[PDB]
Nucleic acid binder design. Structure first.
Ligand SMILES: [Mg+2]
Ligand SMILES: [Mg+2]
Ligand SMILES: [Mg+2]
Ligand SMILES: [Mg+2]
Lengths: 106, 53, 143, 145, 70, 123
RNA sequence: GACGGAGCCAGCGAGUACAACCUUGGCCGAGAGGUCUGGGUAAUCUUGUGAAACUCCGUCGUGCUGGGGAUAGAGCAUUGUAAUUAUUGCUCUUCAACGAGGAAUUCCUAGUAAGCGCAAGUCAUCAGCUUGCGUUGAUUACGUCCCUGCCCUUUGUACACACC
């Protein structure tokens, strides 16, 4: 009918850690409910985006600096399923701030 | 509408022009921000950059 | 119990290899010897002149044996050092690539080094055997 | 393993091309005393000659010296690539040239004179007593020498 | 050049008669008693070392110390 | 008699050989920078100036110097095709005259103009 | 120590589709560089950034010497529409001042001082600068008001625009 098992990679990216974790948990729950071939929520090394600015606008004063850093959390999950099921899983369980991304197919 | 009104401005401090001010001075072009420094500092939390350490 | 290059004092092994090469005569010297810099950030050509390109070749071979896949740029990077830029701090400068390339070619001709998938160069079976023999010889000498 | 002796059969303290090329200094690193022959060039010349580099400049047979001299003035004759010379492609003739000893200085002077005549910026700078190569002198070099 | 390090034969001879039942036999040591140095002293030492007499204890680069056979 | 002082050249070619060569020969002959410049596709850097020079040459006081042409492209190459013709090179203030020898080979117009009045305190 | 080989180990990074980012691997070139091909929107490819200082064996052995590298002269490259008022990269040559720096005075107490690179920042191109990062890694206090600055207490004041 439709059920032919593919190779599905799902990417998750955010700045908020807790939200991301929640999303991951939700995904895992969904997987459990659908009980499919599963590879765990693989965590990629968090990416710290750095900026260095002189605190002054004008330049006069003791030369003081800023370290404005933005940390990126990137995590991926691997599933073997029909694509429709994956879509269904991912159409719900969306939280604002977390980017849900699907590779789909081998 | 003049015969010319432009000199080659593809690179250098002539090409890069800020999002907010339009300053050619102190421009942060890292990660493709193109925001001049002071302005960036003022609105850093809005971008998502924070001062942790 | 068995001998391989990985079990030998390195410098000695290299020397042995060089000697072997010299004995052979076979390699193909391109004729840049006694003219060239080795690294483009140097004050002098080799302090042996007659040879030591053999030595270089041997070293390269050893490196290849040690690793999986080796190229020209990588070799240059390995062999280059810090150029005295005058009244300015030192910087890493890659070695003379052409020389490296020539060496590689020579090796290939000999039947020591072999072009690999993905890119770069690996070792031939004959080459491996030769290396082993050299190692054995070195061991014997040590004994 | 053995020391090569010689009591004093090969006479030390020599002169080559006008000025002094002294003993106890190596075959290559005593040729540096000759203006125009630097280091690498000297080494190349030595190689061409076929001299032991474990040798003093104080020794050397006359034939070898002669050969070296020959190599010196005309290098395009020999197996020297000749694209590491003073006047390559040249100011006047269009030939590979490398002046030596008492000649290079003269040539330089001539060049300077020519520049002055032309009335280029470098010439003017030279006339003044200043830095040609854009090394801006708000400071640096304050003894006139 | 302030001499001491040249070539000669008398010097060599002297060196040769300065090895059995001896404590100090280095490059620096050699230099000290108005004799040869650099990469000549070592050679001289070897010339005696090849025919027994001097034994090597340390063989580092540009630093070597020697002791006679007991 | 065969030589007085020494006859003047680019990198071989004599005074008479130079004047009748156009630019390709010069390009072939020149130092590397000049060659590179020539390779890089020029448009109206020499196209009008050369024409002007030619025009000047056409009408002459005979065995002296043609009508003085004024240049703003103060960083232009002197090729042995504009030899002799007097040109005024810009500095910000006032154009400055250039007499062109068979020794101005591939040299710029800027090294001749000089944009500052030189220092006077104790040279 | 210098120079030659050879040995050969990092951590922060950064990186393009509307552009021209990072660029291995193959050939050409003493270099610089070309070139063809790629791989990478990246824990995936550059990159194990096989970075320097270092360690091993050799050549010079304390002489403005092979210490040191300034000015110079000429060529060959590269970026850009444009390099003279050398942009810079490389090649040969030139070899200047300086044998550890007076009156002064800065910084520092542990993975710190110092040595050494690398890295992003600006950047079309340019690092002797800068924020970071590792690598190698000490000496000496573990204290006191003598100096210097600050603070407080008690005092004096005709100052309170405050000892200018
Ligand atoms: Mg140094
Ligand atoms: Mg990596
Ligand atoms: Mg010198
Ligand atoms: Mg600049």
């Amino acid at each position: 009918q439709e059920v032919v098992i593919h190779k599905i990679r799902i990417n998750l990216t955010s700045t908020k850690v807790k939200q991301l974790e929640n999303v991951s948990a939700n995904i895992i729950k969904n997987a459990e409910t659908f009980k499919l071939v599963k590879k765990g929520p693989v965590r990629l090394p968090t990416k710290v985006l750095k900026i260095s600015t002189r605190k002054t606008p004008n330049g006069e004063g003791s030369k003081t600096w800023d370290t404005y850093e933005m940390r990126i959390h990137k995590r991926y999950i691997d599933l073997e399923a029909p694509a429709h099921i994956v879509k269904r899983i991912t159409q719900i369980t969306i939280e604002p701030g977390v980017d849900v991304e699907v590779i789909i197919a081998a | 509408e003049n015969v010319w009104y432009s000199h080659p401005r593809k690179f250098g401090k002539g090409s890069r022009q800020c999002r907010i001010s339009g300053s050619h001075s102190g421009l942060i072009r890292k990660y493709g921000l193109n925001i001049d420094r002071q302005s960036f500092r003022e609105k850093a939390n809005d971008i998502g950059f924070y001062k942790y350490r | 119990p068995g001998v391989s290059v990985r079990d030998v004092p390195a410098q000695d092994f290299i020397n042995n290899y060089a000697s072997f090469l010299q004995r052979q005569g076979k390699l193909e010297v391109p004729g840049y010897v006694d003219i060239v810099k080795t690294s483009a950030g140097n004050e002098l050509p080799p302090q042996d002149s007659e040879g030591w390109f053999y030595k270089r070749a041997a070293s390269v071979a050893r490196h290849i044996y040690l690793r999986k896949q080796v190229g020209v740029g990588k070799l240059n990077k390995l062999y280059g050092g810090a150029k005295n830029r005058g009244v300015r701090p030192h910087k890493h400068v890659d070695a003379s690539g052409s020389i490296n390339r020539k060496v590689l070619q020579s090796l290939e001709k000999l039947g020591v080094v072999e072009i690999s998938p993905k890119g770069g160069r690996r070792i031939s079976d004959n080459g491996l055997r030769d290396l082993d023999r050299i190692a054995a010889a070195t061991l014997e000498d040590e004994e | 393993s053995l020391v090569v002796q010689e009591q004093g059969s090969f006479q030390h303290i020599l002169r080559l091309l006008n000025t002094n090329v002294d003993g106890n200094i190596n075959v290559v690193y005593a040729l540096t005393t000759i203006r125009g022959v630097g280091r690498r060039y000297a080494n190349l010349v030595c190689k061409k000659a076929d001299v032991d580099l474990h040798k003093r400049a104080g020794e050397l047979t006359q034939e070898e010296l002669e050969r070296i001299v020959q190599i010196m003035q005309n290098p395009t004759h020999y197996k020297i690539p000749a694209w590491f010379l003073n006047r390559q492609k040249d100011v006047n003739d269009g030939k590979d040239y490398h002046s030596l000893a008492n000649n290079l200085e003269s040539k330089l002077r001539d060049d300077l004179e020519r520049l002055k005549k032309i009335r280029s910026h470098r010439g003017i700078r030279h006339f003044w007593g200043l830095r040609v190569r854009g090394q801006h002198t708000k400071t640096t070099g304050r003894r006139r020498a | 050049a302030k001499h001491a390090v040249v070539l000669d034969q008398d010097k060599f001879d002297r060196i040769m008669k300065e090895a059995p039942t001896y404590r100090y036999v280095s490059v620096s040591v050699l230099v000290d008693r108005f004799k040869l140095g650099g990469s000549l002293a070592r050679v001289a030492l070897r010339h005696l070392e090849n025919e027994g007499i001097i034994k090597p204890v340390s063989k580092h680069s540009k630093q070597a110390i020697y002791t006679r056979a007991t | 008699r065969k030589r007085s002082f020494k006859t003047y050249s680019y990198k071989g070619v004599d005074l008479e050989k130079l004047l009748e060569m156009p630019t390709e020969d010069f390009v072939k002959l020149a130092p590397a920078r000049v060659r590179r410049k020539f390779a890089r596709g020029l448009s109206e850097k020499p196209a009008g100036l050369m024409k002007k020079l030619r025009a000047a040459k056409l009408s002459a006081p005979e065995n002296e110097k043609p009508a003085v042409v004024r240049t703003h492209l103060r960083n232009m190459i002197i090729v042995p095709e504009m030899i002799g013709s007097v040109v005024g090179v810009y500095n910000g203030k006032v154009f400055n005259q250039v007499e062109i020898r068979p020794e101005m080979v591939g040299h710029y117009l800027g090294e001749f103009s000089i944009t500052y009045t030189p220092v006077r305190h104790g040279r």
